[PDB]
Amino acid sequence: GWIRNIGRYLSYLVDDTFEEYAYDVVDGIAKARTQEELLEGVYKALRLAPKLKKKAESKGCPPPRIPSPEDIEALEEKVEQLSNPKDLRKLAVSLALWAFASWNNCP
Amino acid sequence: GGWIRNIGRYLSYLVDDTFEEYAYDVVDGIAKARTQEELLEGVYKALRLAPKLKKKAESKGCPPPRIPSPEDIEALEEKVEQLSNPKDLRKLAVSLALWAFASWNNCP
Amino acid sequence: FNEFKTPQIDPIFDLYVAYGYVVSLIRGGAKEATLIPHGASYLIQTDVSNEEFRHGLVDALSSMLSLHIALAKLVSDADFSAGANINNVYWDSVPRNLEKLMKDLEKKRSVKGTATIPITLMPSAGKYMLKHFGVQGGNPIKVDLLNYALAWVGFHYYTPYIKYAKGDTTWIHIYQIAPVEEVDMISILSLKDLKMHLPHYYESNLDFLINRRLALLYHLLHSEALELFTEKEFVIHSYTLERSGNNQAIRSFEEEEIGKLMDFLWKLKRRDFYHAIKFIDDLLKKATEGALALIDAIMNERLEGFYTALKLGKKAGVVSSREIVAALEDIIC
Amino acid sequence: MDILLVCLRFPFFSVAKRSYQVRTSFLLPPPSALKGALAKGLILLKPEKYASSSLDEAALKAIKEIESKLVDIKAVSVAPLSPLIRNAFLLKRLRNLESGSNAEKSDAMRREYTFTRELLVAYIFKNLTQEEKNLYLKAAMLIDVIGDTESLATPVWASFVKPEDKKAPLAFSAPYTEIYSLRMYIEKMRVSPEYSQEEIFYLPIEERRYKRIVYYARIYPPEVEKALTVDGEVLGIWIP
Amino acid sequence: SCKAFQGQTLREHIEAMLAAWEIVKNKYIPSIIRVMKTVGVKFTEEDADKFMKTLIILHDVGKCSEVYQKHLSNNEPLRGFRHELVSAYYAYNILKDMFKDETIAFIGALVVMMHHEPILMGQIRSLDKEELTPEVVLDKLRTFNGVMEGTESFIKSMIKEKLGVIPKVPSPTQEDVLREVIRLSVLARHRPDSGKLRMVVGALLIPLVCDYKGAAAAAAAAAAAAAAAAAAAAAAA
Ligand code: NI
Ligand code: NI
Structure with missing residues (x-):
């Protein structure tokens, strides 16, 4: 459900193979109470795409893949109607939950 | 209303490869829009590069960029004029600017 | 139906004696034996004879004493x-009482004495009891030797426990699993499977045996007896014994539940097993605070606890594979 | 039979059983505790009638007078209107009533306080006269504390009612002596307080779990031809 | 015509199994009737032959219940499903009718459950690169949507065609198999005969694991595995 693809992209900010350790964005996406800050955090996480691209390119392993545009609108087609924070947490926490998965990137 | 994807398709050409146009400042401005006027300024700055990319797209064996239609501009103006609150304005500005960084298959 | 009655004294010691009755019956035979809880009495219904029950009890005592003689006034690390x-x-008191019971029963002689009950079999006991305007000297509480031995058999055979030394002090976590609706012999034997002997861990790396809830999670992680808790309702009564400077006292008596933790463990390990136990052990050894947050989330159904635990684990050494993350997501629903 | 109905909306129980180290608390307040509380109510409401050299004899005489107007040794009953739980607590219980150990020997000890959102208390009388009906009805209220001085208590309403001979499930507490003829909860309750006795009482409490947590809900017992109605719902009760 | 193996049908596989055991009974029957005396059941050599043939005729019947055949249809992975776990459910129900005794049926079901891969339950080291654990086999068995129809008469055509004693087959469901397997595991793990059960179960399992001769050989060091099949020379001439 377009969760693994974005989780593997968020995993690029925590893994030691990318020696930048973007942990603030993980806290922002996990600690989201309403609509605006969750989108702000996911934008901040996605903004570091060239960082990861040039880090993997300059290190040797294949560059990371950006989340596909096909499920980008899928993110906003559901979170819009999660007016209640209680059910919004089920996805806000899960976004960072999948950010710590194994996600083998470079050999 | 469906125009977010259309405008994000053009926005993605400002940061993707195979274009030699790495305009991240305009993306940051259009995504850090605190008020409507600066959001419109960022939109204009992004759209000012439409000839910049359209002329050179055909010079590198790539399809021309999907420049947003005037209907998209009308929809954006309608959405901006109805938003006097920075609360939903922040998420609206984030929504279209998020499409800039995506794995678009611009050049086959 | 022999329907053995169990003395009503203390719903913890009462549970121990009524819950060792089942192993006494099993060692003597007694097919189709069940336990009906009466709030605290915990009656047992079966078709066994009194002599057969005595034979099972003496078999249990013989096994226990044979285990005791393996280590050495004789003191064993059992x-x-x-x-x-x-x-x-x-x-030294307990082995003498048990061998006295063996000698009395093997000669077809019912015991005719009473003995002090230790705090281990019932934390509600101790040294002093408030009568009217003060306490009673010695140890006021006494129990008949037969029920004393039966409760000891139950505690030794069924209830898991953990001992952590850490130099001069000593912590002993004791856990007993209490049914609440009804159980048959197979269920109680499945619970008996949890008991493992000689849990004297000590060392220094395994310093996470403090924080009793964390210790019970660690013990249950490596146990794969039976996922009975998902189809039957069980509770856990647990308590800690501390010997800080020869000052014997109890500092924790919280009453948690075992169904949620077992359900969580089964749901997590259903996807991957190699990446489950290694994950949990590494997180316990490195991120103790993360482990506490995780167990709090399990017991309270809290979303932020899992994220905090994973972040703390990934900070130091935890791989935190994908399959366990997917299992957690499925549990979240 | 004029039955006194009161509603106790107080969070935590405070009565502990015969226990040491960890102080095991009663799931429901024993008749001894409620009798003592009502005796205290008589003490501070009408102090002219009960006057003693020491508080022990005043309490004993108040208890004796209450039992004189009581139906029999089978004392006050209760109905748990809320699920029950065992809430553990840690206290700094000093130990100085034993031999030696001076007078300042304080060590941490556990004493759980049973939590309750709502409970109902029914005293069973034998048609006390009107001039004292108001006396005991006022004595029913101002029940400030239960157990020890730690857990406060408050009333909601006080009334007198007949059993109207109505069939209903017995949602009260009764001794396991006569109701033997009738998922059971029976235990030692110490009906009679001691002052220098022990009857097994049944409880309408079960340890069922609905989804994950157990608490302690109702027992839904067999119906009894003797009952009483409160706030619409009718609950059965046993009387001699 | 359901096939247990990739290219071998169940019928031929069982025939090869029993043919392999034919030349072994004279070597193992005295060694197997002795170990039965310590559990409380004693029977003649013919009864031991009947019991072992009952185990042979029914050792892997879960290989054809809408799951193993579908996985073994073209290439589908097993996903760590233990078919043999349900086979004991038949044996405990079948052997009970064959011998009119409880403990012999229990031990037969236990031994037929014992082969293939054991279920490691109760304490473990902090590593397991296998599916031996019960927490995954229970989840896999949760998908047991009964058994295919052909099996019901299949056993009816199996025990009758070889010796013939009494035909009887149960009706497996989702919950009865779970209850039976848990009861078997509990009664094996916690009956006061602690090590004796393990010893006798292994003694009964040793003849049964001779399926290498019956099935297609896939092991290099099969010479050692075939040493036991060899017997003493009948005569010089
Ligand atoms: Ni096989
Ligand atoms: Ni085979």
């Missing part, structure tokens, strides 16, 4: 000699 008994006098 469950019912020194592993769980925090008081030094009981280390």
Whole structure:
């Protein structure tokens, strides 16, 4: 459900193979109470795409893949109607939950 | 209303490869829009590069960029004029600017 | 139906004696035996004879004493000699009582004495009891030797426990699993499977045996007896014994539940097993605070606890594979 | 039979059983505790009638007078209107009533306080006269504390009612002596307080779990031809 | 015509199994009737032959219940499903009718459950690169949507065609198999005969694991595995 693809992209900010350790964005996406800050955090996480691209390119392993545009609108087609924070947490926490998965990137 | 994807398709050409146009400042401005006027300024700055990319797209064996239609501009103006609150304005500005960084298959 | 009655004294010691009745019956036979809880009495219904019950009890006592003689006034590092008994006098008192019971029963002679009950079998007991305007000297509470031995058999055979030394002090976590609706012999034997002997861990790397909830999670992680808790309702009664400077006292008596934790463990390990136990052990050894947050989330159904635990684990050394993350997402629903 | 109905909306119980180290608390307040509280109510409401050299004899005489107007040794009953739980607590219980150990020997000890959102208390009388009906009805209220001085208590309403001979499930507490003829909860309750006796009482409490947590809900017992109605719902009760 | 193996049908596989055991009974029957005396059941050599043939005729019947055949249809992975776990459910129900005794049926079901891969339950080291654990086999068995129809008469055509004693087959469901397997595991793990059960179960399992001769050989060091099949020379001439 377009969760693994974005989780593997968020995993690029925590893994030691990318020696930048973007942990603030993980806290922002996990600690989201309403609509605006969750989108702000996911934008901040996605903004570091060239960082990861040039880090993997300059290190040797294949560059990371950006989340596909096909499920980008899928993110906003559901979170819009999660007016209640209680059910919004089920996805806000899960976004960072999948950010710590194994996600083998470079050999 | 469906125009977010259309405008994000053009926005993605400002940061993707195979274009030699790495305009991240305009993306940051259009995504850090605190008020409507600066959001419109960022939109204009992004759209000012439409000839910049359209002329050179055909010079590198790539399809021309999907420049947003005037209907998209009308929809954006309608959405901006109805938003006097920075609360939903922040998420609206984030929504279209998020499409800039995506794995678009611009050049086959 | 013999329908053995169990003395109503203390719903913890009562549970121990009524819950060792089942193993006494099993060692003597007694097919189709069940346990009906009466709030605290915990009656047992079966079709066994009294002589057959006595034969099963003497078999259990023989096995326990044979285990006791393996280590050496004889003091053994066993469950019912020194592993769980925090008081030094009981280390010699209990084996003498058990062998006295063996001698009395093997001669078809009912016991005719009463003995002191230790704090291990019932934390509600102790040294002093408020009568009207003060306490009673000695140990006011006494129990008949037959029920005393039966409860000791139950505690040794069924209830899991953990001992952590850490130099001069000593912590003993004791856990007993209590049914709440109804159980048959197979269920109680499946619970008996949880008991493992000589849990005297000590060392220094395994310093996470403090924080009793974390210790019970660690113990249950490596146990794969039966996922009975998802189809039957069970509770856990647990307590800690501390010997900080020869000052024997109890500092924790919280009453948690076992169904949620077992359900969580089964749901997590259903996807991957190699990446489950290694994950949990690494997180326990490195991120103790993360483990506490995780167990709090399990017991309270809290979303932020899992994220905090994973972040703390990934900070130091935890791989935190994808399959366990997917299992957690599925549990979240 | 004039039955006194009161509603106790107080969070935590405070009565502990015969226990040491960890102080095991009663799931429901024993008749001894409620009798003592009502005796205290008589003490501070009408102090002219009960006057003693020491508080022990005043309490004993108040208890004796209450039992004089009581139906029999089978004392006050209760109905748990809320699920029950065992809430553990840690206290700094000093130990100085024993031999030696001076007078300042304080060590941490556990004493759980049973939590309750709502409970109902029914005293069973034998048609006390009107001039004292108001006396005991006022004595029913101002029940400030239960157990020890730790857990406060408050009333909601006080009334007198007949059993109207109505069939209903017995949602009260009764001794396991006569109701033997009738998922059971029976235990030692110490009906009679001691002052220098022990009857097994049944409880309408079960340890069922609905989804994950157990608490302690109702027992839904067999119906009894003797009952009483409160706030619409009718609950059965046993009387001699 | 359901096939247990990739290219071998169940019928031929069982025939090869029993043919392999034919030349072994004279070597193992005295060694197997002795170990039965310690559990409380004693029977003649013919009864031991009947019991072992009952185990042979029914050792892997879960290989054809809408799951193993579908996985073994073209290439589908097993996903760590233990078919043999349900086979004991038949044996405990079948052997009970064959011998009119409880403990012999229990031990037969236990031994037929014992082969293939054991279920490691109760304490473990902090590593397991296998599916031996019960927490995954229970989840896999949760998908047991009964058994295919052909099996019901299949056993009816199996025990009758070889010796013939009494035909009887149960009706497996989702919950009865779970209850039976848990009861078997509990009664094996916690009956006061602690090590004796393990010893006798292994003694009964040793003849049964001779399926290498019956099935297609896939092991290099099969010479050692075939040493036991060899017997003493009948005569010089
Ligand atoms: Ni096989
Ligand atoms: Ni085979």
